[PDB]
Design a protein around this ligand. Structure first.
Ligand SMILES: [Zn+2]
Ligand SMILES: [Zn+2]
Ligand SMILES: [Zn+2]
Lengths: 64, 49, 49, 111, 129, 85, 42, 49, 147
C-alpha cells in the first residue's frame, strides 16, 4: 500500500516548506517524491532499511 | 527424642537428594523434577518439625 | 533460600549444597539460640513478612 | 557452522544448480562458488540436549568453593576431586551432577 | 592472580582494589572505583607447601604487639593489613571464596548437650581447603 | 489461573482406564510436541535419497523440485500419547 | 602459635575501631573530595 | 530455499492432532462426594475427574 | 542491545542496537561495519568465540541476512548519520563526520575517545553480544538486579 507522506521536508527549488511529499514504493524498490509548488519529483531505488529521511538526503545529494 | 527425629528427617532428605541426583526419583504429575523435589523436601522438613 | 551467591546460599558452604541447613533449615530452637547463617535466614523471612 | 569465502569473506548462500542437479554454495559479492559436500541446508530441533557439557573448563579444580567428593576417578583413580551439575538454565534441566576429575576432567554420571 | 594478590597483601596495591577471578567465564576482573563496599577478613594460609595451610596467618605475636601499640623491629590495624594477615573484600570478590565461620572450624572437630546450639552438619564436601 | 473441572460419566467416573482414554482425547497435544528434529536435506533425485538414515526404508517403501523437508520425532512422546506416526 | 581465642578477636576489633572509628567513611570521602575532587573539576 | 523453512515453521505450529484447542494439560483428579444410599443415608463415593 | 523477535513470530530474530542521540535503532552488523569491521568473517569471529555453538550462528544469521545492503564504512555511517536526531539536510558532506563523531564519542566513552582504537570498541561490542546471546540461550543466569 502506497503511503503519501506530507513530511515537513522543505523543497530546495521552490522556496517552500512542507511542499514536499516523500512517497514510498517498496513493491518494486523505487523511490518517489512529490512537490506541491514546483511539483518536481525525485526517483531512486529504496531497500527495506531506507526511510523518507534517506530518500530526502539522497535527493539533496542529487540536486547538488 | 527430638534430636534423633531431626537426624532422621535430615537422613530422609539426604536420601531424597541422593535419588533425585540419579534420575530415579518419581516425577510428580503437573510438576517438573526440581519443583517436585523441592515440594517433597519441604513436606519432609515441615513434617519433622 | 535462593543461591544468591554462585551456586550456594552463603559463601561459607561449598558450591551446590542442597541439605536443609544449606537452604534455610534452622535446626535449633530459640532457647538454644540460632547459629549465624540460620539467624541471617530468619532475618530474611522476617523482612519478607 | 556457517562459513564465508577465502577472498571475499561474505557468507555463502546455498543456491540450487538446476542444470546439474547438484547443490552449490555461492556468495553474492563475488562469483566464487564451490561444491556442496552434504545435502544438509538447515537443521532445527525442538528436543535439544546441547550445552550440558559445553561448560567445561580447566581451572575448575583449584577453586576451593567447588565441593569435594568421594567418587572414584576412572582415569586418575584419585580421591580428591570436585563435581558440578549442568549449567543449563532451561526449566527441563536435570540433577545429573557432572562429576569431574582433576587430571582428565571427564564428565560422567553416577546414575 | 596469585602474584597480584601477593602484591596487594604486601601493600604494593591499595587494599580496596579488588582482585576477582572468574573461572566458569574464564574471565579475570579487577576494580578500583569509588563507592564499592568492603569488609575485612583473616587470611587463612591455604598453600599446601607448609604446615600453616589450614591455619591462620595471624599469630599471638601480632596480638601482643597490637596490645603494645609499637612493633618490636605505631603498630596498628594498618600494620596488620599491610603485614599479610587481613585483606578487605567486597561482595563481588566474596563471590569466589570459602570462609570458615570461626577459627575453630579451621580445625576439624571430634558432648551432645541438650541446651546449646548445634553447628551445621556441613558434610557435602568431605575435604575442605 | 484458568482452570476447568470436568465431570466424567458415571461409568467413566468410577472407571480409571476410560478416564485415561478420555483425558488423552481432550489433551491438546500438537505435532510440535512429538517432533524431535527438523533438517532440510537437498535431495536432487526424487527417486531416491543420499542419506543412510532412511535410504533403506524409503527405497523399500518406493517398491518436482528436489528440496526435501525432513523431520524427526521422539518415540516416547508418540507412544505416551498413544498416537502412532 | 596456640589457638586464637575470642578475646584475641576482640582485641583486634578494638584496635581496628581505634584506628578508623565509626564514621570514618564519611570523613575520608569528604576529605578526599576537598583535597582532590574540586581541583579536578575546575 | 526460504519457502521450505517457512513451511517447516508453519508446520511445527499450526497442526493440531488431538484434543480441544486451548488445553495445555489435564489432571486425573480424584474426587469424594456425599451420595445417598439405599437406606436413605449419605455415603462417600470416590469418583475420578 | 535489544534482541528483537518472538518465538516463530517476528520472523527472523534480528538484533537491533540502540545508540545515544538517535531516534531509531540500528542493526548490529551495520554498527560492526561502520566501526571498521565491514566484512562478515571478522564480524562473526569477533561476536562468536564458540564456533560449534551453531545456535549463535543461526540466531545472528538473520542479522547477516539483512546486513547485506550495507557493504562499506561509508553508507553504513551515513545510515547512522541519516538518523542522527540532528537537523534535516546535513547531506553526505557533514553527515558522515557527524556519524563518525557520534561513534568515536558518546559511545562506550569509558573505554576511549581517540581514533585508531576502534579495535577495543569492536571487541567490547562482541563480548556484549556474546553474553546477550548466551543469556538468550539459557546457558547462564541473568544477573540479579538486586545483587
Ligand atoms: Zn518545490
Ligand atoms: Zn563474496
Ligand atoms: Zn579424576
Amino acid at each position: 500500500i502506497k503511503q503519501k507522506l506530507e513530511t515537513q521536508f522543505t523543497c530546495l527549488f521552490c522556496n517552500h516548506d512542507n511542499s514536499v511529499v516523500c512517497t514510498l514504493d517498496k513493491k518494486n524498490s523505487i523511490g518517489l517524491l512529490e512537490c506541491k509548488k514546483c511539483n518536481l519529483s525525485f526517483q531512486a531505488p529504496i531497500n527495506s532499511l531506507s526511510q523518507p529521511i534517506d530518500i530526502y538526503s539522497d535527493w539533496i545529494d542529487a540536486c547538488e | 527424642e527430638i534430636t534423633h527425629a531431626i537426624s532422621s528427617a535430615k537422613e530422609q532428605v539426604q536420601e531424597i537428594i541422593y535419588k533425585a541426583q540419579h534420575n530415579e526419583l518419581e516425577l510428580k504429575p503437573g510438576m517438573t523434577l526440581r519443583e517436585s523435589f523441592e515440594g517433597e523436601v519441604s513436606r519432609t522438613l515441615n513434617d519433622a518439625r | 533460600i535462593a543461591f544468591g551467591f554462585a551456586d550456594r546460599s552463603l559463601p561459607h558452604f561449598t558450591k551446590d549444597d542442597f541439605s536443609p541447613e544449606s537452604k534455610g533449615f534452622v535446626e535449633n530452637s530459640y532457647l538454644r539460640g540460632l547459629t549465624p547463617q540460620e539467624f541471617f535466614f530468619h532475618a530474611m523471612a522476617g523482612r519478607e513478612g | 557452522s556457517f562459513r564465508f569465502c577465502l577472498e571475499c569473506n561474505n557468507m555463502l548462500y546455498p543456491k540450487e544448480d538446476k542444470e546439474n542437479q547438484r547443490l552449490l554454495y555461492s556468495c553474492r559479492n563475488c562469483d566464487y562458488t564451490e561444491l556442496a559436500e552434504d545435502p544438509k541446508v538447515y537443521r532445527h530441533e525442538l528436543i535439544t540436549n546441547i550445552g550440558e557439557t559445553a561448560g567445561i573448563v580447566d581451572d575448575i579444580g583449584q577453586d576451593p568453593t567447588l565441593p569435594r567428593s568421594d567418587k572414584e576417578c576412572p582415569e586418575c583413580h584419585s580421591r580428591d576431586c570436585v563435581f558440578f551439575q549442568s549449567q543449563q538454565r532451561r526449566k527441563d534441566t536435570n540433577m545429573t551432577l557432572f562429576y569431574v576429575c582433576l587430571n582428565c576432567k571427564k564428565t560422567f554420571r553416577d546414575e | 592472580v596469585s602474584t597480584m594478590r601477593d602484591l596487594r597483601r604486601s601493600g604494593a596495591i591499595s587494599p580496596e582494589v579488588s582482585i576477582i577471578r572468574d573461572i566458569r567465564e574464564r574471565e579475570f576482573k579487577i576494580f578500583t572505583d569509588v563507592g564499592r563496599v568492603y569488609r575485612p577478613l583473616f587470611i587463612v594460609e591455604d598453600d599446601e607447601s607448609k604446615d600453616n595451610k589450614g591455619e591462620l596467618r595471624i599469630t599471638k605475636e601480632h596480638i601482643r604487639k597490637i596490645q603494645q601499640g609499637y612493633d618490636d623491629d605505631v603498630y596498628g590495624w594498618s600494620s596488620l593489613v599491610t603485614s599479610g594477615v587481613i585483606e578487605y573484600v567486597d561482595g563481588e570478590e566474596e563471590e569466589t571464596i570459602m570462609i570458615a565461620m570461626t577459627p575453630e572450624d579451621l580445625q576439624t572437630r571430634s558432648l551432645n548437650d541438650t541446651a546449646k546450639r548445634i553447628k551445621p552438619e556441613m558434610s557435602t564436601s568431605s575435604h575442605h581447603t | 489461573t484458568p482452570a476447568l473441572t470436568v465431570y466424567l460419566d458415571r461409568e467413566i467416573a468410577l472407571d480409571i482406564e476410560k478416564a485415561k482414554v478420555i483425558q488423552s482425547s481432550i489433551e491438546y497435544t500438537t505435532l510440535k510436541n512429538v517432533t524431535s528434529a527438523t533438517e532440510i536435506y537437498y535431495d536432487p533425485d526424487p527417486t531416491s535419497t543420499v542419506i543412510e538414515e532412511d535410504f533403506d526404508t524409503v527405497e523399500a517403501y518406493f517398491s518436482q523440485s528436489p528440496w526435501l523437508l525432513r523431520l524427526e520425532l521422539d518415540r516416547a512422546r508418540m507412544l505416551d500419547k498413544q498416537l502412532t506416526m | 602459635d596456640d589457638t586464637i581465642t575470642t578475646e584475641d578477636c576482640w582485641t583486634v576489633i578494638s584496635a581496628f575501631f581505634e584506628e578508623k572509628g565509626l564514621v570514618s567513611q564519611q570523613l575520608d570521602s569528604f576529605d578526599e573530595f576537598m583535597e582532590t575532587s574540586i581541583q579536578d573539576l575546575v | 530455499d526460504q519457502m521450505l523453512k517457512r513451511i517447516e515453521a508453519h508446520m511445527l505450529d499450526l497442526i493440531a492432532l488431538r484434543g480441544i484447542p486451548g488445553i495445555s494439560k489435564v489432571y486425573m483428579v480424584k474426587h469424594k462426594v456425599s451420595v445417598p444410599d439405599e437406606s436413605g443415608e449419605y455415603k462417600n463415593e470416590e469418583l475420578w475427574a | 542491545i535489544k534482541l528483537y523477535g518472538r518465538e516463530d513470530k517476528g520472523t527472523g530474530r534480528t538484533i537491533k542496537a540502540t545508540l545515544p542521540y538517535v531516534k531509531q535503532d540500528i542493526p548490529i552488523v551495520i554498527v560492526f561495519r561502520a566501526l571498521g569491521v565491514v566484512p562478515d568473517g571478522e564480524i562473526l569471529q569477533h561476536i562468536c568465540y564458540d564456533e560449534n555453538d551453531w545456535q549463535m550462528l543461526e540466531m545472528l544469521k538473520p542479522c547477516i541476512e539483512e546486513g547485506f545492503v550495507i557493504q562499506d564504512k561509508e553508507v553504513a555511517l551515513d545510515f547512522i548519520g541519516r538518523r542522527g536526531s540532528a537537523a534535516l539536510g546535513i547531506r553526505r558532506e557533514k553527515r558522515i563526520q557527524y556519524a563518525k563523531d557520534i561513534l568515536q564519542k558518546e559511545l562506550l566513552p569509558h573505554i576511549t575517545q581517540e581514533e585508531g582504537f576502534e579495535t577495543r570498541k569492536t571487541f567490547f561490542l562482541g563480548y556484549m553480544v556474546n553474553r546477550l546471546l548466551l543469556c538468550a540461550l539459557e546457558r547462564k543466569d541473568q544477573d540479579d538486579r538486586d545483587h
